[PDB]
Amino acid sequence: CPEDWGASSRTSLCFKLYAKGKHEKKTWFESRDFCRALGGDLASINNKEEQQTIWRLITASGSYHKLFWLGLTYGGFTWSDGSPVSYENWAYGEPNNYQNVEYCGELKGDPTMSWNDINCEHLNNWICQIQK
Amino acid sequence: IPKCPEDWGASSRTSLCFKLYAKGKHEKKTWFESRDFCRALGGDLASINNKEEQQTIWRLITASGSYHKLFWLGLTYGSPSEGFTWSDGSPVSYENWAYGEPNNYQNVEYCGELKGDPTMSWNDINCEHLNNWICQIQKGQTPK
Ligand SMILES: [Ca+2]
Ligand SMILES: [Ca+2]
Ligand SMILES: [Ca+2]
């Protein structure tokens, strides 16, 4: 794994925590771009191993209790009677409300390492992942 | 397939991408500061390894009307350890330097600059001088 990046055990994933300070917390979208501009992406957690890895990273750094953006994101219309949407007559720019808010998953940096979904525009620390 | 970032002059047949930095006279830098600037982005001071790469830079100069300006290039004099000779110029065969010697010769003093005119000619000058500069980045990479 790259320049000081949490080395997974059974996955080619390397994780790195980014929590340099409050004033430098980014949104989920900024966080994703940031990680992508590094040849990676926001961290995905697919097993307990990857989780302990991030937790060790949190311990070694002493980032206890801080929240982090993980690559978790959520994301058309249907007829109630089951019929298929074979026809549409939406007004200009419609539908659009179902996109005024988006939700993303953040990691709670304590022993539970639990996830919570919140507005993707909130300011958070984040965790990147980049292939070995 | 590797490509160049947010509009950085791309060298068609090579892997280098170039970008001019001439924010004006009061924003100029020294070779080292320039080198630190470029590396920070994830790139480096520009190297010109062939005519095609030179032409890429020249086109960048023309697109920004940056005519007659001087830019820092990655050109730097490294002081080869084989550079010592005797008074008459004869090469040094036998050697008996103290532990860690010689070492004062390694001081980095001279760097190269690009004259942004049609000639695209280079000149070595003191690295401490303030100039505009040019960075390069590997295709497939992204500024930071
Ligand atoms: Ca809750
Ligand atoms: Ca929630
Ligand atoms: Ca000279």
Side-chain angles (χ1 to χ4, degrees), chain A, chain B residues 1-143:
Chain A
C1 279
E3 38 171 56
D4 308 314
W5 283 53
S8 192
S9 309
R10 187 187 179 186
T11 62
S12 72
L13 292 182
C14 307
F15 301 112
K16 183 171 178 183
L17 300 168
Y18 285 78
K20 187 202 172 187
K22 181 187 181 179
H23 294 291
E24 299 336 308
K25 291 176 183 177
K26 312 169 79 65
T27 64
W28 184 85
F29 305 99
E30 299 175 317
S31 300
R32 179 184 54 174
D33 286 330
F34 183 99
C35 296
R36 283 177 168 178
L38 298 189
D41 204 326
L42 283 177
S44 57
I45 298 191
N46 303 67
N47 63 68
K48 314 301 184 71
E49 183 185 66
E50 295 181 355
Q51 173 168 130
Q52 295 203 318
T53 306
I54 298 182
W55 172 244
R56 310 187 203 311
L57 295 181
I58 289 177
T59 293
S61 72
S63 299
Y64 303 102
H65 295 291
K66 296 188 175 188
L67 296 304
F68 307 76
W69 271 141
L70 290 183
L72 285 166
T73 179
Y74 182 66
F77 291 71
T78 283
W79 291 112
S80 53
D81 67 320
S83 55
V85 188
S86 64
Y87 174 75
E88 292 180 55
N89 198 46
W90 298 102
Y92 187 79
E94 292 286 318
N96 57 349
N97 294 72
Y98 73 126
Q99 298 170 182
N100 282 41
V101 183
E102 293 194 295
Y103 296 106
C104 292
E106 69 180 354
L107 156 66
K108 194 168 169 45
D110 59 30
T112 62
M113 291 274 93
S114 286
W115 318 331
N116 157 63
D117 71 317
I118 53 172
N119 201 310
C120 301
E121 293 299 6
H122 277 312
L123 297 173
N124 251 339
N125 297 294
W126 63 96
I127 308 172
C128 294
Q129 62 170 45
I130 188 173
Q131 299 304 67
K132 299 170 178 174
Chain B
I1 173 179
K3 308 198 186 189
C4 291
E6 302 75 55
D7 295 355
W8 276 56
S11 173
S12 56
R13 303 311 308 177
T14 75
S15 68
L16 298 183
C17 306
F18 299 110
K19 181 168 183 56
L20 302 180
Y21 288 94
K23 307 169 179 177
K25 273 188 176 181
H26 300 92
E27 298 305 294
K28 292 174 176 176
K29 297 189 173 192
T30 63
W31 184 79
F32 297 104
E33 296 176 317
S34 293
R35 177 174 182 174
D36 296 334
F37 178 81
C38 294
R39 287 165 178 287
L41 293 176
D44 194 359
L45 270 179
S47 66
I48 308 185
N49 307 284
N50 53 59
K51 171 81 174 185
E52 297 68 32
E53 291 178 353
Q54 179 183 89
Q55 182 59 14
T56 301
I57 297 180
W58 165 241
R59 296 306 292 290
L60 287 191
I61 293 189
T62 291
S64 60
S66 299
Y67 298 73
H68 302 144
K69 285 188 174 192
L70 307 192
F71 302 74
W72 272 132
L73 291 183
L75 229 41
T76 181
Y77 186 77
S79 295
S81 57
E82 301 281 294
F84 288 87
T85 73
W86 288 113
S87 182
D88 73 334
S90 53
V92 180
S93 49
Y94 177 73
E95 270 175 326
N96 190 38
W97 300 97
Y99 172 82
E101 291 285 324
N103 50 24
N104 294 65
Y105 77 96
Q106 300 172 319
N107 278 296
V108 179
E109 271 300 81
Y110 308 105
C111 294
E113 68 172 4
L114 169 61
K115 185 172 183 58
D117 59 37
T119 81
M120 288 288 88
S121 70
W122 314 336
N123 164 43
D124 73 317
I125 186 175
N126 195 292
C127 303
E128 301 164 347
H129 270 283
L130 298 175
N131 271 317
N132 291 296
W133 71 92
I134 306 171
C135 295
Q136 74 178 31
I137 269 206
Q138 293 307 312
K139 288 183 178 181
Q141 291 285 48
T142 302

